[PDB]
Symmetry: D2
Subunit: 445 residues, 4 copies
Amino acid sequence: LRSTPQDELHDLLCVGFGPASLAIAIALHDALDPRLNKSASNIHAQPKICFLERQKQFAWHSGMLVPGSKMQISFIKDLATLRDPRSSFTFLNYLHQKGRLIHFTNLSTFLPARLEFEDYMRWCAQQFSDVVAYGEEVVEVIPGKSSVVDFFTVRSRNVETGEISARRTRKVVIAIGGTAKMPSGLPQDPRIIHSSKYCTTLPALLKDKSKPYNIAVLGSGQSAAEIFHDLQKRYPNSRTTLIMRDSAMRPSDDSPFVNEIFNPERVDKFYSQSAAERQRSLLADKATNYSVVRLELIEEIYNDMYLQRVKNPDETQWQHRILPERKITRVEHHGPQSRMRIHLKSSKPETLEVDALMVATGYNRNAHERLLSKVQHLRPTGQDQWKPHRDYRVEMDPSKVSSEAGIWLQGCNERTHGLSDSLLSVLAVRGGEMVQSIFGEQLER
Amino acid sequence: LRSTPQDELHDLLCVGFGPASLAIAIALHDALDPRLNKSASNIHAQPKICFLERQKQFAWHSGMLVPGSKMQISFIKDLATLRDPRSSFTFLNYLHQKGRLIHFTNLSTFLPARLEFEDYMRWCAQQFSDVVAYGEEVVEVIPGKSDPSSSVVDFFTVRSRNVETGEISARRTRKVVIAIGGTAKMPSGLPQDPRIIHSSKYCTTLPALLKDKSKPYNIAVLGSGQSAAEIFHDLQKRYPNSRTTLIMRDSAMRPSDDSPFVNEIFNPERVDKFYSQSAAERQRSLLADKATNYSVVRLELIEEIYNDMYLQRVKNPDETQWQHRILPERKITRVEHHGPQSRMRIHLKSSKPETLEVDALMVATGYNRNAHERLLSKVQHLRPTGQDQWKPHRDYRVEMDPSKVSSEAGIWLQGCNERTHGLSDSLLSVLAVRGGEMVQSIFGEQL
Amino acid sequence: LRSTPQDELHDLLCVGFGPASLAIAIALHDALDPRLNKSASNIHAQPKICFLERQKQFAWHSGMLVPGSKMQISFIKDLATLRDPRSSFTFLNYLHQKGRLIHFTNLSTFLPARLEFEDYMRWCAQQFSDVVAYGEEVVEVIPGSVVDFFTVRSRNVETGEISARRTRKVVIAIGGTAKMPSGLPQDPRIIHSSKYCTTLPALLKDKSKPYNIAVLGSGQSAAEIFHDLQKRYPNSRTTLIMRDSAMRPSDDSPFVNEIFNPERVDKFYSQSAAERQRSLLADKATNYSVVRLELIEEIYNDMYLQRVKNPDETQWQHRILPERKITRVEHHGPQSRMRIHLKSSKETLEVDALMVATGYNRNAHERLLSKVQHLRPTGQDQWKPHRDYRVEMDPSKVSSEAGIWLQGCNERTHGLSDSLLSVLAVRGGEMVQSIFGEQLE
Amino acid sequence: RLRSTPQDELHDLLCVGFGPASLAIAIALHDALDPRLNKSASNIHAQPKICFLERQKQFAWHSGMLVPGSKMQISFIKDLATLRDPRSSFTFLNYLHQKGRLIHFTNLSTFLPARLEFEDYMRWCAQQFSDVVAYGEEVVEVIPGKSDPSSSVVDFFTVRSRNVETGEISARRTRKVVIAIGGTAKMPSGLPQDPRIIHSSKYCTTLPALLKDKSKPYNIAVLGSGQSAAEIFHDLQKRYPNSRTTLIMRDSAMRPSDDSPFVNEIFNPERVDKFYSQSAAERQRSLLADKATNYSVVRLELIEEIYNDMYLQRVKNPDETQWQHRILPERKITRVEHHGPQSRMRIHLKSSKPESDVKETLEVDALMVATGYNRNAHERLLSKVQHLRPTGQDQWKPHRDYRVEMDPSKVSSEAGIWLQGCNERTHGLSDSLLSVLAVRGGEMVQSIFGEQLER
Ligand SMILES: Cc1cc2nc3c(=O)[nH]c(=O)nc-3n(C[C@H](O)[C@H](O)[C@H](O)COP(=O)(O)OP(=O)(O)OC[C@H]3O[C@@H](n4cnc5c(N)ncnc54)[C@H](O)[C@@H]3O)c2cc1C
Ligand SMILES: Cc1cc2nc3c(=O)[nH]c(=O)nc-3n(C[C@H](O)[C@H](O)[C@H](O)COP(=O)(O)OP(=O)(O)OC[C@H]3O[C@@H](n4cnc5c(N)ncnc54)[C@H](O)[C@@H]3O)c2cc1C
Ligand SMILES: Cc1cc2nc3c(=O)[nH]c(=O)nc-3n(C[C@H](O)[C@H](O)[C@H](O)COP(=O)(O)OP(=O)(O)OC[C@H]3O[C@@H](n4cnc5c(N)ncnc54)[C@H](O)[C@@H]3O)c2cc1C
Ligand SMILES: Cc1cc2nc3c(=O)[nH]c(=O)nc-3n(C[C@H](O)[C@H](O)[C@H](O)COP(=O)(O)OP(=O)(O)OC[C@H]3O[C@@H](n4cnc5c(N)ncnc54)[C@H](O)[C@@H]3O)c2cc1C
Ligand SMILES: [Ca+2]
Ligand SMILES: [Ca+2]
């Protein structure tokens, strides 16, 4: 894909260059490839596209690239295969380019290491370096008129200098993932670290791996369990405590009929349901969110707990402990003492002294609201929320916005499009749909 | 255990001889063995006990002994081991007696075939044949007074119907156990028809209705738990030319949770914790702890069913033309079954707040566990003032008015106490330990 | 690929259209696709290729398409992916074309049903229908002092007529022929595993009759037939006769299975004759001479259930007899059953049929090539393939523009993967380069 | 349980070693004397005079190889009692019940306990025989005893042992001897003596003191390709995260253990009769066709974890020669060179293929040697009685019931010597394992004490 000059009026600008935007770039590449679409042989003009990414290079959840962590999803659900297995951007073709395809085949697994899947996506992203501006953190999207709004100005701050630059585009995609969700009761402190900063921030805080640190973990989903488990290996003499509101870690549902909710063609079914039915369906399938844990990991943690029981029958004396049905009422963290004191109570309708508290409570996916505040008056009268259509384009007042201008949301549409919306599950197929939604008419010539 | 003359006054009578009562028989045998508890060499009188069972011989859910069906619970949770691995009634000792222990070890499984686990319990039950009266269906329990002008009940008379002749018999006992499992729960909208069969009568009744294994029958299955899936899977083999249809309210068959922390709710020692919780917490825990007992399907069976549907997809991409189909998120609104036509018409709608014509409808909708209320109606006036339900204590004895019932008489409930004692109550999970508790509760002082 | 007239001089004729020839066809198609290799936009001439296959349509071991039978190899080792995942002939693209890709993904398996993998190869094969003559059984290859082409004669299986085609280069890719123990007699009741699904139901028509059926062997095919008979003829009495003491599991462990990697062919081929011979023994625990662990366990479980019902093994409906050999079969006379005599391999059975699951010989190319074996270098009594599978010829008797290639029968020189699906995709690429490379430049 | 016999009295049986094999005998004797388990034992008012001598200071089971996460290779049903009598108080399940852990083990859904747990189970069994086990006693010889100088016939034996802490020699007299001493470390010949060359049996006990700083980038080599080699190779990579470990194997690859049910029937207790009755040639051949289930192979699950770990190295760097942890297949050690503790040792390698020639040198801080065990130490212990064997025998020959052949004109039939754990050649691969101990313990009690228990 060839670059567009910074000051030209773009056809599409995408905010963020994680897997969701990367899937759009790949699908646009594939749509322009005469090998993949026969009609693309007669397309001599590439749309003017640009991506703004805050990081200095492509990276995927590097704070949680914990040792031995695996993908939670089959590699067939990579960024291209479910749309076109012939794509050059498939995981298997990436392995072939690295000389690793037979070696991966002998693993007999559908679940690559997360480190490996990140490298796969890094390898894909490098092929889009002419249209990705790294180190650009978008701060706002502003209306533009050339009395109907027909373009948008996207302002971004360069991470190295702090300077604000502006780009004009007819269409915008917001694909910025999630922001760390912290319980409101917790204070800010270098010893309280969210799961998104585990690998990147915790080793600097606790530098001596042999010290008997007391480390608490708040949560009961996949990241909490991974952090609890990894800490016991990384700090072999530590005392770790898992604080959970629930009565037990719960396994993710890997059964085949249930997992059909992640099928790409199921987005059509989910979207067509009423709000009441969508709301309840998202709970009747709670057992496959990031609120649950891979069975294998639950079993490994249980086995580790059992071995403590063999050595000592008194669970309160264990080096590593799980405290179910608890909530944090208070954190004391002021003073020269290097440990904080955490006060715990039952979560139905006790104090720890810790060197650190890892908080694995997931993410908010509302950061697009701040970015879009200066265009929210273009929504239909009476709307206080952005409403995405089936093709992820947000509803606009047609008398205020030209039909050739628009804004799409990616990754924050679980309520309308289903649990798969924030995952890798449907990115390949969705990237293709996005190309048809945004560029279809333009590509028709 | 030696028999008591049928017309004598018993110390204990148990209604039903399924796993729950058998575990009591086993636990009492073990309590009387001076080798297993030393404090028993000085017992020179065995309690007078008898069990009444309506089936003609011991059998465990024989209507659902589907070929290849497996236990859903580890064999370690047999009828003795969790109470005493030394008991002669453990599953591993049964295998040793049959000459099969090394061969089972090489299976490397915790889940025996249901056929084998039934035979294990059959092997246990034969050792009590002198104290089990088969072919007797208890119909009522009535008050008994040694002195008729006394104001206090000191025994109960248990009346039973001979299943072969219909004669009513009576036995007297100081104490009564009701361990009668469940009765078929049928959706209230369904009509009565010999072509509508509950899952509990699958193996025994459906082959009599559909005699031609080669006819292309249309057979529907209602439900989405373990029994529905087993019947759905088995029908495709037993009637190879049939067209089977699985009708479920839910959107998908859901797997049983086999993960280790969740399943601790089935631990025997959790019964104390659960029982002592408030009504509000117990009611909430029963919803949040785990999906209902047989309301979900063993993962392995789901995958086998899924693979079979995939193979249909390989042969024909059009799901509507498949021989075997799943119709999720449906409810039955009407069944037409009148006229000389031998197929019924089932009317379907979405299950959120279509027609099949079938030769048979298997209904895999579980059980009610309230039949003790009918059996005990003639003694329910002995409950404390104002009670309209039987209320069991921790040791499963129901509350009685102490001024109306002698303290040497009582009634215990087994298997119907999920509300007060937890999800494990109706399962095999805690029978070994519970049988031990029941022996202490019922015979402890006497022993 | 466009068809070339039958009587023209072909560039290549391949004998057989099984997976091995199909992978060559696929690789040739891919070599001509400018979309896959850029150096192909300036290739304006397709080579003249033709395939002769004796079956009437594409079919893959249909005598062993037993219900529930599964692939023994990961689907990634299909006919293209290991050579080029972008190919339109991958198993995943096939599933996508069938509208089944997400549905297979939810199976969470690398091992498709054999029925499905056959349909994948059938779907591939249909794209070459213009260059494949089905129902043609090749009977001889004849030279044509410089032999500079070959004439391949084939017998039409339906009419019996013999037809001939001329080509400069020949590939022999005919798999294996049924290996029958030399002591067994010929009798319609003695059937090799390769004709199980095809022939036994013709012999034993009543699925409910209490037939006595023996199975001879202990490998994957023996176990599949033994297991299947118990479902296909539910009242039968089956007996598994094996020389070994037990069914042995196939080794699925990752280090051992690296001998099947495509890049191992270079290493194996370059080893001395002595090392190749020993290497084939010291890793032969994976030759269809062993059984998928899952199947062993299912069979053992079935035997266990018989033990639950009757502790006396001699009374079981279905039995395994280890460490046995057949010493004599009586099959002369009107009695519908044969009597099999057994002895220790360190007792008589009366059977309606005997299935023989003893594998295959891979020497049938010698008979086909006898009329050109004088073109070998002096003193050679065996066909000797180079690394690129082309057989050695005397250069003063054979033009360098003519040659003969062997496929699937070269285990001794190229390794255990040679007769499997394991390296077909990569080998197809090598074969296209060996036979057509200069022509493509 | 069993009451002690005074040290200087004439014992009925003395067992050399108190590992699992002798422990199964003690357990089986206890059970034979238990009226709950054997009906005929309420009328047994005299316990045989039995004693066990164990050189370690307390019961311990392969403590050098109690590596973190290590598992049993065998189903817990094959414990020290269950296959003989599941009602026994010494079953693993009864042990779990006594520890208050049975339901917790049930929720593990595994037949393969941690080795740490299975050792504790056997320690729990052993503690009940503490009155008849003399720990810290290393038996050094067995000598003939003639209770009558007016006779040449040997009718008892004297067993001498050296106390490992004081060095004093103690002597006990017995009619019957069991030798159940497991194996001695099998070391490649030619190796120099250096405390950094550690056999797998001393891994957990010796290596951590040698390499104290878990963060240091040590170079550690591992020799072997069986289960112990793989466990050590894997464990080293976790215990020393910055180390460079190298696995040296003669074979081309680590091989998986055969877990299939028909093959594993060779381990059934009732198969000892069939194996024992075979000819010498057939037994020799049968041992070779089943050498794929010894400790010479690796649990599939562990192979896969090691393979996965190697693959992750491939992702970071395609150059295998630069990997932190490496496997060098088809290699043999030609020499191990050292220059004093101040320096690293040099391991020299060559191809193990026939001399039909790549080579390497490694510089390592330690070398772990996982090359198995010899099981012939009974010959040294029995040297002073080997003249009592039948004419022409240069080997101890055990009968079916494990009693060795003696010249009847030199030895009374009321005296005898039995061997346990070293009889694979006559009794099969299970002989050295846990696989048939429960049943064999029963047989040994009948062989040694049967008549005595009857009368
Ligand atoms: C360890 C882990 C934990 C996970 N936890 C959850 C979870 O709790 N819930 C859930 O539904 N999914 C979760 N996922 C799945 C995850 O969301 C998907 O795998 C995938 O990351 C989604 O891609 P995305 O591009 O929509 O978001 P991302 O992977 O988040 O990509 C967003 C990109 O936008 C960039 N960006 C953000 N803001 C700006 C800005 N203002 N300007 C410029 N660039 C910006 C970011 O730097 C980032 O590169 C998790 C995955 C992993 C690996
Ligand atoms: C196929 C199958 C399905 C199951 N479904 C469920 C389920 O839906 N929900 C759940 O919680 N558990 C279910 N279970 C578990 C089951 O309840 C236990 O395994 C076990 O059967 C409980 O033993 P019980 O003795 O309390 O009941 P049972 O096994 O039912 O024993 C009850 C006995 O009492 C006899 N009896 C009944 N009434 C009388 C009478 N009036 N007079 C004399 N005798 C009488 C019966 O004949 C029977 O033998 C199921 C098990 C199987 C195998
Ligand atoms: C059920 C089963 C059993 C197997 N057993 C073994 C085994 O015992 N040992 C082993 O090493 N591999 C075995 N395999 C693997 C098998 O060889 C490969 O999967 C694959 O079939 C090899 O492809 P091929 O094209 O080389 O042979 P094939 O699949 O055999 O193809 C050969 C083709 O040539 C055709 N042909 C034969 N003769 C002629 C002729 N004279 N003229 C024209 N056409 C002809 C045949 O009709 C056939 O289509 C087995 C596979 C399966 C599915
Ligand atoms: C890590 C590990 C590795 C194994 N490797 C092998 C293997 O390579 N090959 C194989 O066939 N089996 C192997 N096994 C199986 C093992 O042999 C059995 O599990 C079990 O230990 C056998 O019991 P045993 O009592 O016969 O021998 P051991 O368990 O070794 O017990 C022998 C006891 O005798 C004591 N003893 C020795 N000499 C004397 C003496 N002179 N005086 C007094 N006491 C003495 C020892 O201290 C020891 O306690 C291994 C097991 C484990 C856990
Ligand atoms: Ca479990
Ligand atoms: Ca594998």
